A paper describes a structure:
SARS-CoV-2 infects target cells through the interaction of the viral spike (S) protein with cell receptors. In the following, we describe the analysis of SARS-CoV-2 spike stabilized in the prefusion state by two proline substitutions in S2 (S-2P). Using a new consensus-based image-processing approach together with principal component analysis, the flexibility and conformational dynamics of the SARS-CoV-2 spike in the prefusion state have been analysed. These studies revealed concerted motions involving the receptor-binding domain (RBD), N-terminal domain, and subdomains 1 and 2 around the previously characterized 1-RBD-up state, which have been modeled as elastic deformations.
Instead, we have calculated a new ‘ensemble’ map at 3 Å global resolution in which the bias has been carefully reduced, followed by both a 3D classification process and a continuous flexibility analysis in 3D principal component (PC) space using a GPU-accelerated and algorithmically improved version of the method of Tagare et al.. As can be appreciated, the slope calculated from the newly obtained map is almost zero when compared with that for the map from Wrapp et al., indicating that, in relative terms, the particle alignment used to create the new map is better than that used to build the original map. Supplementary Fig. S2 shows a representative section of sharpened versions of the ensemble map (EMDB entry EMD-11328) compared with EMDB entry EMD-21375, in which the glycans can now be better traced. Details of how the tracing was performed can be found in Section 2, while in Supplementary Fig. S3 we present two map-to-model quality figures indicating the good fit in general, with the obvious exception of the variable parts.
Numbering used by the authors:
A (entry chain A): 299 to 335, 526 to 620, 640 to 676, 689 to 744
B (entry chain B): 745 to 828, 854 to 1041
C (entry chain B): 27 to 66, 82 to 131, 157 to 161, 165 to 173, 189 to 241, 263 to 298
D (entry chain a): 336 to 445, 448 to 525
E (entry chain A): 992 to 1041
F (entry chain C): 745 to 793
Write the structure that this text describes.
């Protein structure tokens, strides 16, 4: 994050430091039986593992899985919407598989600010972290390096999905379901009124930007010079 | 995930850190919009156990514990009215969950029912709902005796008027036009952005692995460059569309915040 | 003795599968309500051709495609036969063999694209005779052979409709199964437009 | 592709009437050819036999015949001789392979009859085939379809004796030729 | 070569000026709100709550 | 109105459709603006003679 922010000190916040895509292993190729007799090598298939695959000249990277959708006897591979291959039938065993893009998502750190401490809590967005101290699943992704607490406080760093993280005491980063506010039930009754008997006058600050810097770019001197 | 394309893209410059920065800006702006509109209550207000608000009936708009979502009947109706991870596109979840927003509105509603406009000013001071309605009639110019002499009739009118909203929402289609239009516009933008990939963009073929495979790297570089410039142009167009539409929705969200303040929290003399 | 080609006469464009989505395809199709030339001979092949035939006694036999059919240049000679269907580039009807292939209402669609011959067929339980009722069906059981010539003759060897495909976009609705339940013709009508 | 019925054909053909087999509508596993250890020569021109198992061709020809040892060197572009001029000629831009192996165990007994052409009024064009058995007129006087003075029968038999020298024993030759135009293809 | 450089630098300048226009629209909304506050809250007393 | 140019333009994609959609949205928005500003009265009122 110090690199992607171009600084040696980053303020308290959550910064999308990079992106994380599970890399494919043991790419596979398949081509129908060589019944009429150059030739094309073919190998066995896999399941539930992000793999680069070649099915009948169609190259793609994903997790192949069993699919309940039935093709018609002539259809080879299917596209659900927006011209994206979503299903494909293998030419050897005549079986339909569903393709899902193997997990990918932004990796963003949560830091309380450098001068406060050097601790960080990694958040891998929308990744069910069965794969790469305590690993806590949240509806906004996976949190690595942040203790989960049961009590709730006001939101400090917005993680997402109703969850915020903050640096608190020993001296750890904690993630919690943010508290909307204090709870009170004002005592209503059909013959009860609450009348103020005193008052406080209060001055508050409202800050509003009204202008920008009047920049002027010489088009020709910038483009050519 | 093509390395040679990665290098040819790298040589263009800082366009993508810029696009990511714009998108993350509008992303956090959305959370700011929701929080600004709904989080105007200091502390969530529970409504009293027995509802005897001077003959007025708030069962429809008040939260029902029986529902798992813990949102009011009309809110569930509105949710049902609308009908709301491919290649590099991700949709980040909103910071405030739908349940949290329902809780915000329940707090605001309980506060305005029990304490009138006092809770917006400061500490929530409770008045019997009839007397508060008399306050508000004094606000609009009608003397307060008009309410008390006609309290049952006014209660019946309010109850039947709330009843009409349920029919209007449940039966009349496209009641939630603006919100459905927002959803459709966002779906349209993402869909056309994904469709642009299939576009040839003047190269020999759209699919990048194929253009890599059947040409020499010196020649393939030019076709890959055409694909990159076209895709980058489409993505830049999507980002600028998002920026402008986010500005428009920010204006609407500011209007909603102002109406929440000036009308829910207090009575307003601004006609219409 | 013409007769309007009704809705029927649409085929699956490509191999792909689509579930409960509307798609737009741009290739040769048979126009909606286009008066096909019912024959009761000689037939040209300006472009891809929809051939639809009804025979109670299955009198009609295979199609003798040919660019010239003067024995000077290679023919296509689709024929069919109880045991098998035989098609050769080279019986009673006659007129450098390149390739031979043997394998196994009556909708038939034949088209030649970049030298590839494509066949689309369908079988229907017809109940009204002498009219093709407006309805929807398609399949792509085909045989591909790289001829690379522009066929211009049919000479089918008891009446068959024949219509000519044209390159106009269609909007095809897709069922949950992936079959093409319905379609509309873009340039047929302003409403369909 | 039927490379087996070309290479393991029980009987071959005389070089003057060389046999041509057109390969079409099939998948050719060329590895069977170059992984075999029973060939004397496997000269390919303008094409890599180890690199066409993921390649397609618009046209494939297979030419098989029988010659003798010192004549295998004539089955190549830009060659001259009895075989190259009067029997089988390859073009200068030949794209294909010349495969040959000794066939003394098959084409030599002490009962096959292999022939070759002696004379011709002009050299053969590439891939031309002359099977005419008309009397060659070498002089001014015209033959009357009969052999005589300055008149010779154009075909001779090979003297394939099992005790011949290596260069005089028979060699079976297969000539695969390829074409790759911007046109449909059926041999992959 | 100068054509490639011109096209790239022109695209960068164009996206810069477009983002500047959008940011200026945001600032104009903020300045109009500030003028409304200065007119309704400094030049007078405002009843519209919060 | 040149077909050779139009066929090349097809490759670029949905750019023309996007531009047409944006412009027609601006167009309908203008009518919405005038309607919102001026159509505040349910029924036309005539001043007495
Ligand atoms: C309405 O609210 C206002 C709040 O501002 C309130 O005025 C405050 O009254 C209290 C009570 O008198 C003041 O507190 C005292 O102020 C005197 C100075 O005048 C101090 O000397 C006092 O300190 C001594 O007493 C304390 C309590 O006994 C001890 O704890 C302490 O150690 C000292 O011995 C004490 O602070 C306060 O100053 C004012 N505030 C202001 C701003 O004037 C007002 O009374 C309320 N009105 C009603 C009707 O309730
Ligand atoms: C392809 O589309 C067809 C038609 O839309 C679907 O056919 C119908 O599917 C349902 C649910 O699968 C079937 O209901 C079940 O039928 C069985 C007997 O077939 C019955 O015992 C069950 O209690 C239930 O009612 C329905 O019958 C079936 N229609 C038929 C067979 O004519 C089909 O489901 C789609 N394909 C897939 C893979 O979903
Ligand atoms: C390709 O060859 C394989 C090899 O046998 C075939 O696989 C068999 O498929 C049948 C179909 O039900 C199964 O019962 C067998 O158990 C399979 N055997 C093996 C070893 O896989 C496959 O069907 C062939 N496909 C085609 C299109 O010919
Ligand atoms: C935080 O709250 C959760 C509520 O589920 C606690 O988890 C339960 O703990 C009790 C007592 O240890 C167990 O009997 C339950 O089986 C637990 N339920 C689940 C779903 O895990 C958790 O112990 C609490 N942690 C702290 C530190 O208070
Ligand atoms: C407030 O309105 C609700 C909604 O109509 C009332 O609840 C219904 O009352 C009727 C009696 O007329 C019952 O038959 C329904 O089952 C009730 N529920 C619904 C969902 O309709 C409620 O009674 C009203 N408040 C008071 C105090 O009567
Ligand atoms: C029906 O068609 C088949 C074509 O396959 C005919 O049988 C062929 O006859 C030729 C001529 O002897 C053979 O070379 C083929 O091997 C045969 N093929 C098959 C599949 O048998 C047959 O004569 C035709 N007529 C009938 C009555 O079967
Ligand atoms: C941050 O830490 C530095 C010491 O490294 C300290 O001087 C500074 O006051 C700190 N900032 C704040 C806001 O406390
Ligand atoms: C994550 O995956 C594991 C196994 O694949 C599964 O048991 C678990 O329920 C999943 N959790 C989520 C939140 O997807
Ligand atoms: C004979 O067929 C072959 C292809 O099988 C073709 O290349 C050749 O030109 C044909 N001959 C004539 C005279 O058309
Ligand atoms: C038949 O010929 C093939 C070449 O096509 C060769 O590889 C094989 O060994 C031969 N069969 C024998 C020798 O049994």
């Amino acid at each position: 994050t110090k690199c992607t922010l171009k600084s040696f000190t980053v303020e308290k916040g959550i910064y999308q430091t990079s992106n994380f895509r599970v890399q494919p292993t043991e790419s596979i190729v398949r081509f129908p039986n060589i019944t009429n007799l150059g030739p094309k090598k073919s190998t066995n298939l896999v399941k539930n593992k992000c793999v680069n695959f070649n099915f009948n000249g169609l190259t793609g990277t994903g997790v192949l899985t069993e699919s309940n959708k039935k093709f018609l006897p002539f259809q080879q591979f299917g596209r659900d919407i927006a011209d994206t291959t979503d299903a494909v039938r293998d030419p050897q065993t005549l079986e339909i598989l569903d393709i899902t893009p193997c997990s990918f998502g932004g990796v963003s750190v949560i830091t309380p600010g450098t001068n406060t401490s050097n601790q960080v809590a990694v958040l891998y967005q929308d990744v069910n972290c069965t794969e790469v101290s305590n690993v806590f699943q949240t509806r906004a992704g996976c949190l690595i390096g942040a203790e989960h607490v049961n009590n709730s406080y006001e939101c400090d760093i917005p993680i997402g999905a109703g969850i915020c993280a903050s640096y608190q005491t020993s001296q750890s980063i904690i993630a919690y379901t943010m508290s909307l506010g204090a709870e009170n039930s004002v005592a209503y009754s059909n013959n009860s009124i609450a009348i103020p008997t005193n008052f406080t006058i209060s001055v508050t600050t409202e800050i509003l930007p009204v202008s920008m810097t009047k920049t002027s770019v010489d088009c020709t001197m910038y483009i050519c010079g | 995930d093509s390395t040679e394309c990665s290098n040819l893209l790298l040589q263009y410059g800082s366009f993508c850190t810029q696009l990511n920065r714009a998108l993350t800006g509008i992303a956090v702006e959305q959370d700011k919009n929701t929080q600004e509109v709904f989080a105007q209550v200091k502390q969530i207000y529970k409504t009293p156990p027995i509802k005897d608000f001077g003959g007025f009936n708030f069962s429809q708009i008040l939260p029902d514990p029986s529902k798992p979502s813990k949102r009011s009947f009309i809110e569930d109706l509105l949710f049902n009215k609308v009908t709301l991870k491919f290649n590099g596109l991700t949709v980040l979840p909103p910071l405030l969950t739908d349940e949290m927003i329902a809780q915000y509105t329940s707090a605001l509603l309980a506060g305005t029912i029990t304490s009138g406009w006092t809770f917006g000013a400061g500490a929530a001071l409770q008045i019997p709902f009839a007397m508060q309605m008399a306050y508000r009639f004094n606000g609009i110019g009608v003397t307060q005796n008009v309410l008390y002499e006609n309290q049952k009739l006014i209660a019946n009118q309010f109850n039947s008027a709330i009843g009409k909203i349920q029919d209007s929402l449940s039966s009349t289609a496209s009641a939630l036009g603006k919100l459905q239009d927002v959803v459709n516009q966002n779906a349209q933008a993402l869909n056309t952005l994904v469709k642009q990939l299939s576009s040839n963009f003047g190269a020999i073929s759209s699919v990048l692995n194929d253009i890599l495979s059947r040409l020499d790297p010196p020649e393939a570089e030019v076709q890959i460059d055409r694909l990159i410039t076209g895709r980058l142009q489409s993505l830049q167009t999507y980002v600028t569309q998002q920026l402008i539409r986010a500005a428009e929705i920010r204006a609407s969200a500011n209007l909603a915040a102002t109406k929440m303040s000036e009308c829910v929290l207090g009575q307003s003399k601004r006609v219409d | 003795a013409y007769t309007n080609s009704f809705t029927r006469g649409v085929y699956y464009p490509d191999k792909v599968f689509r579930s409960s989505v509307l798609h737009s395809t741009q290739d040769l199709f048979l126009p909606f309500f286009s008066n096909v030339t019912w024959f009761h001979p000689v037939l040209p092949f300006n472009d891809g051709v929809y051939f639809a035939s009804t025979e109670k006694s299955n009198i009609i036999r295979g199609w003798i495609f040919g660019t010239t059919l003067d024995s000077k240049t290679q023919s296509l000679l689709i024929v069919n036969n109880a045991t098998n269907v035989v098609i050769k580039v080279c019986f009673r009807v006659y007129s450098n063999c390149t390739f031979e292939y043997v394998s196994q209402l009556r909708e038939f669609v034949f088209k030649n694209i970049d030298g590839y011959f494509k066949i689309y067929s369908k079988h229907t339980p017809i109940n009204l005779v002498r009219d093709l009722p407006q309805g929807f069906s398609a399949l792509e059981p085909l045989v591909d052979l790289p001829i690379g010539i522009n066929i211009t003759r049919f000479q089918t060897l008891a009446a068959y409709y024949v219509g000519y495909l044209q390159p106009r976009t269609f909007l095809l609705k897709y069922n949950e199964n992936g079959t093409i339940t319905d379609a509309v013709d873009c340039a047929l009508d302003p409403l369909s437009e | 592709c039927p490379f087996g019925e070309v290479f393991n054909a029980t009987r071959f053909a005389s070089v003057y009437a060389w046999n041509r087999k057109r390969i079409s509508n099939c998948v050719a596993d060329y590895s069977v050819l170059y992984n075999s250890a029973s060939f004397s020569t496997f000269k390919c021109y303008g094409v890599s036999p180890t690199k066409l198992n993921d390649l397609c061709f618009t046209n494939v020809y297979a030419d098989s015949f029988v010659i003798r040892g010192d004549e295998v060197r004539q089955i190549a572009p830009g060659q001259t001789g009895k075989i190259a001029d009067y029997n089988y000629k390859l073009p200068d831009d030949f794209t294909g392979c010349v495969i040959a192996w000794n066939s003394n165990n098959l084409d030599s007994k002490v009962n096959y009859n292999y022939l070759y052409r002696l004379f011709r009024k002009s050299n053969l064009k590439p891939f031309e085939r002359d099977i005419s058995t008309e009397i060659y007129q070498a002089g001014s006087t015209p033959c009357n379809g009969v052999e005589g003075f300055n008149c010779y029968f154009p075909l001779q038999s090979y003297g394939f004796q099992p005790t011949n020298g290596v260069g005089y024993q028979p060699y079976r030759v297969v000539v695969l030729s390829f074409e790759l135009l911007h046109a449909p293809a059926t041999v992959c």
